[PDB]
């Protein structure tokens, strides 16, 4: 095979160790792991938690620990592959990685969010066993959010002929893309290693979802004496299936190098044929259709999985966000895994790809800013060249909240970075996330095609009169001001979308959704941000309910209650500008000891009128006028029972929403998102546990220790809950529930069969669920 997975059968040693790169090192005592891997999500050795209040990351990393780590792997290469080029590909190593092959140092990679490929042909032994050793150094406070540590993304082993397609050298564009026909331009770079000449035939083939050839082109390429030969031609596709959010149809481009009727090299690229256009008068247009960007910002971690970027974990995040109403995502503030972009291609999710969070001036003393002047070309090239073939990517972002933006020195860097992107891709606009915009920022915003405003709703109309051609989107918005921020999008054609901070909760930058700024080390055990539309487990939070009233065509109504005591202790020193926090509300109706006491009940609705009932008794009908911002409020004395909301449009009942008090816990409820997984060693199954009453209602007061056990060829990759102040272990067989729920992830084995997951709670019957492996 030309390209195979390399994640299997690695060795790991936490901490530094002498001669860790030597073949003479005895590694039989090392832990055997299968990538992806993140050692910062595992427990600190000697303790039972991955958090510590004395951590070098503090609030930024959620009080986690990095340090030094070593990876080793023994791999055999056949003697028949002699003369072939051998390359190891890493999609991401965080951070400061050094790689040895057979005792010899190969290269060093600093940036932990970019992919890189190493040619080890001059280091390998054919017909024998080889050794690759990687040292990871994630030391000090280098990031404002949780990063993880180690080889947290997929690795690949590439074996090609000396004459082969260069990595990321093929760029597929669709200059013409209409429902009648489409022109597909394929530009490729032939790596002429050994500098041999002759004639090669380039065969390009476009196949549909059924692998049926729709267009084929053959070109004779006379090989130059140089090591690189640029080739290209265009193909026509009749009546194409246009890629969109509702029809994410993907084609496949098959490029083949033929010589003497033999296949020298062969590559496959998934493409989506679509047309994107940006303007101030008509906003964003996809295939000629005008639409707003219903966007949200996400970070790279996967909660209980740390930074481990499993294909299923990345895909599930897109599936959940798409079900919540999002059609666009801002990847803050770094390149993602390839698995996440593949999921956006297959599911229909627009994406802003962002390169850096800092430039020459950084946030801490030991961050990427100290290397920026030497490495920004390599890392910016890595993002664009790797991801320019994805139809989901609609924008390249070169920075977020850049310091000294109005300074001429930084303005010049913005022009230099913009021009570098345009040497690689001119089909997508260049953008950036800019905060605290003043009139003097015009020189910084001028090189950009589209401008991303960070929390600057007040300048939408004023800057339009000064620059009537400037295109604007809210690159970051507050959850507490969701109504006003989205109204600024609907009222203006040059404001094309809004990206909530955040759409998915994350580890690090802790309690910005509760305690907020200024960030203080005293807030331990806070470790979640508590600012996402979805919590760490993937469940919708109340702010997601309000956002649905803004984005849904259908009638929507949701009932929430203000708790009598704050869910978490308050911060009396919260700044007057840190308003990422949403009002403290819950979606249950169990308040023992407060019977007869007045509760604040809120209904988020997009309907004209809502009438609230408590156990059949009407509490009054209210008009959903514009001043209420889709929030209708009632004062209700507490009583165990049913809260009923009836919605009306044009005087007719259109929907009913209920919130019922839970009884005492009597059963465990298990539900897996997928009960049929692939026995490949990397597929996942997300199992949700709930403590429910006799009627299946989740009791949100239940917080019990659950003991999990597994039977079969499978493993528990992690456990967790949505408690933002929890210091519980993620890599363990037990986990407490929070608000009557916790989450468990099962990793498949490599034998086909059945998997029995067992959950045990004090005073309840044992519960089980059966999941099947295949192949």
The tokens for 350 are 């627009």
Give me the long-range contacts of 14-19 (CB less than 8 A, separation at least 24): 14/39, 14/45, 14/67, 14/69, 15/67, 15/68, 15/69, 15/70, 16/68, 16/70, 17/70
Tell me which residue of 152, 146, 160, 3 sits closest to 69, measured CA to CA.
152
- Decide: 93 and 151 in contact? Cβ < 8 Å: yes
Tell me how many domains the chain contains.
4
Both 326 and 256 in one domain: the answer is no
**Residue at which a domain ends, from 222, 238, 273:** 273
579 inside domain? no
**Residue at which a domain ends, from 525, 557, 589:** 557
Both 111 and 37 in one domain: the answer is yes
The tokens for 200 are 């090669």
- Within 8 A by CB and 6+ apart from 200, the residues are 163, 190, 220, 221, 223, 257, 258, 259, 264
513 inside domain? yes
The tokens for 73 are 């792997």
- SS3 for 669? strand
> Computed over its alpha carbons, how large is the radius of gyration of the chain?
27
User: What CA–CA distance (Å, rounded) separates 384 from 397?
Assistant: 10
The tokens for 719 are 């456990």
Both 238 and 200 in one domain: the answer is yes
User: What CA–CA distance (Å, rounded) separates 337 from 115?
Assistant: 9
Domain that holds residue 736: 663-770
Both 187 and 39 in one domain: the answer is no
State yes or no: cis peptide before 523, omega within 30 of 0: no
Both 377 and 246 in one domain: the answer is no
User: What CA–CA distance (Å, rounded) separates 353 from 396?
Assistant: 5
Resolution given for this structure, in angstroms: 2.4
The whole-angstrom distance between residue 301's C-alpha and the CA centroid of its chain comes to 7
Both 248 and 291 in one domain: the answer is no
Phi, psi dihedrals of residue 382, rounded to the nearest 5°: -60, -45
69 inside domain? yes
Both 405 and 547 in one domain: the answer is yes
**Which residues in the chain have their C atom more than 2.5 Å from the N of the next written residue, marking a break after them?**
none
- Decide: 733 and 678 in contact? Cβ < 8 Å: no
- Give the CATH number of the domain where residue 106 resides: 2.60.120.260
- SS3 for 95? coil
- Give the CATH number of the domain where residue 340 resides: 3.20.20.80
- Give the CATH number of the domain where residue 710 resides: 2.60.40.10
537 inside domain? yes
Torsion of CA 532, 537, 538, 542, to 10 degrees: -50
122 inside domain? yes
Residues in the chain: 775
User: What CA–CA distance (Å, rounded) separates 427 from 415?
Assistant: 18
Both 290 and 379 in one domain: the answer is yes
634 inside domain? no
User: What CA–CA distance (Å, rounded) separates 81 from 102?
Assistant: 18
Both 503 and 392 in one domain: the answer is yes
- SS3 for 268? strand
How many other C-beta atoms are found inside a 10 Å radius of the C-beta of residue 108?
11
586 inside domain? no
- Decide: 148 and 94 in contact? Cβ < 8 Å: yes
Both 350 and 458 in one domain: the answer is yes
Q: How was this model experimentally determined?
A: X-ray
Give me the long-range contacts of 764-767 (CB less than 8 A, separation at least 24): 764/665, 764/666, 764/667, 764/668, 764/691, 765/667, 765/668, 766/668, 767/667, 767/668, 767/669, 767/670
566 inside domain? no
* CA dihedral over 478, 550, 660, 740, signed as positive or negative: negative
Both 325 and 436 in one domain: the answer is yes
Helices (H) and strands (E) in the chain, counts: 8, 45
Both 334 and 458 in one domain: the answer is yes
- Decide: 604 and 659 in contact? Cβ < 8 Å: no
User: What CA–CA distance (Å, rounded) separates 446 from 325?
Assistant: 32
- SS3 for 469? coil
**Residue at which a domain ends, from 143, 162, 181:** 162
């Amino acid at each position: 095979l030309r390209e195979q997975s390399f994640d299997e059968a690695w060795l790991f040693h936490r901490g530094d160790i002498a001669e860790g790169e030597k073949q003479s090192l005895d590694d039989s005592q090392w832990r055997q792991i299968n990538l992806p891997h993140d050692w910062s999500i595992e427990d600190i050795p000697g303790t039972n938690s991955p958090f510590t209040a004395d951590a070098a990351t503090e609030v930024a990393g959620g009080f986690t620990v990095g340090g030094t780590g070593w990876y080793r792997k023994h791999f055999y290469i056949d003697a028949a592959e002699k003369g072939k080029c051998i390359a190891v590909s890493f999609d991401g190593i965080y951070m400061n990685a050094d790689i040895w092959v057979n005792d010899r140092h190969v290269a060093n990679h600093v940036y932990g969010y970019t992919a890189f490929e190493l040619d080890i042909t001059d280091y390998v032994r054919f017909g024998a066993e080889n050794l690759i050793a990687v040292r990871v150094k994630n030391e000090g406070m280098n990031c404002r959010w949780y990063t993880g540590s180690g080889i947290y993304r997929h690795t690949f082993l590439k074996i090609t002929n000396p004459l082969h397609f260069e990595t990321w050298g093929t760029f597929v564009t669709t200059p013409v893309a209409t429902a009648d026909k489409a022109e597909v331009h394929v530009q490729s770079v032939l790596a002429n290693t050994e500098k041999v000449t002759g004639k090669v035939i380039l065969e390009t083939r476009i196949v549909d979802k059924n692998n049926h050839t729709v267009a084929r082109k053959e070109q004779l390429v006379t090989l130059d004496n140089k090591e690189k030969t640029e080739v290209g031609h265009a193909l026509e596709v009749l009546a194409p299936q246009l890629w969109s959010i509702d029809n994410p149809y993907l084609y496949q481009v098959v490029n083949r190098l033929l010589q003497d009727d033999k296949v020298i090299d062969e590559e496959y690229i998934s493409i989506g044929i679509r047309n994107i256009a940006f303007s101030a008068e008509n906003g964003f247009q996809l295939n000629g259709k005008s639409m707003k960007l219903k966007g949200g910002c996400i970070h790279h971690d996967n909660g209980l999985l740390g930074a481990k970027a499993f294909d299923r974990a990345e895909e599930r995040k897109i599936e959940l966000l798409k079900a919540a109403g999002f059609n666009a995502l801002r990847l803050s503030h770094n390149p993602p895994s390839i698995a996440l972009l593949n999921a956006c291609d297959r599911l229909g999710m627009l994406v802003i790809d962002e390169a850096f969070d800092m430039w020459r001036y950084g946030h801490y003393q030991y961050d990427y800013a100290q290397y920026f002047d030497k490495l920004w070309k390599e890392d910016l090239h890595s993002m664009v060249a790797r991801d320019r073939n994805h139809p989901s990517v609609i924008m390249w972002s070169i920075g977020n909240e850049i310091k000294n933006k109005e300074t001429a020195e930084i303005v010049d860097i913005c022009r230099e970075l913009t021009g570098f992107v345009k040497t690689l891709d001119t089909t997508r606009p260049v953008t950036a996330g800019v905060n605290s915009i003043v009139d003097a920022t015009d020189d910084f915003l001028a090189p950009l095609d589209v401008c991303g405003y960070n929390y600057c709703l007040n300048r939408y109309e004023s800057d339009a009169k000064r620059h009537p051609d400037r295109i604007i989107y809210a690159s970051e918005s507050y959850a507490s001001q969701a109504y006003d921020y989205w109204k600024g999008v609907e009222d203006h054609s040059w404001v094309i979308g809004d990206f909530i901070w955040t759409a998915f909760d994350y580890i690090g930058e802790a309690s910005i959704g509760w305690c907020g700024y200024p960030l203080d080390k005293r807030i331990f055990p806070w470790n979640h941000a508590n600012c996402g539309d979805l919590n760490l487990s993937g469940e919708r939070r109340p702010q997601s309910y309000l956002r649905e009233t803004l984005w849904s065509d259908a009638p929507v109504s949701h009932i929430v209650v203000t708790p009598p005591v704050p869910s978490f202790p308050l911060n009396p020193d919260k700044a007057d500008w840190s308003v990422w926090d949403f009002p403290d509300v819950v979606d249950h109706w169990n308040f023992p000891g407060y019977e007869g006491k007045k509760m604040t009940v809120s209904v988020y609705s997009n309907c004209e009128q809502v009438e609230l009932f408590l156990n059949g008794e009407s509490l009054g009908k209210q008009e959903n006028t514009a001043d209420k911002k889709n929030t209708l409020v009632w004062e209700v004395p507490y009583a165990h029972g049913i809260l009923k909301a009836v919605s009306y449009n044009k005087g007719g009942e259109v929907g009913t929403a209920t919130l019922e008090s839970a009884g005492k816990v009597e059963k465990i409820r298990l539900s897996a998102d997928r009960t049929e997984i692939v026995a490949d060693g990397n597929d996942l199954s997300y199992i949700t546990l709930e403590l429910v009453d006799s009627k299946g209602i989740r009791n949100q007061l239940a917080e019990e220790l659950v003991a999990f056990s597994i039977e079969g060829d499978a493993t528990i990759e992690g456990v967790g809950n949505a408690n933002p102040m929890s210091i519980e272990s993620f890599v363990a067989n037990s986990r407490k529930t929070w608000r009557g729920s916790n989450l468990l992830v099962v990793r498949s084995g490599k034998s086909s069969g059945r998997i029995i997951v067992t959950a045990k709670v004090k005073a309840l019957p044992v519960a089980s669920i059966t999941i099947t492996q295949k192949k």
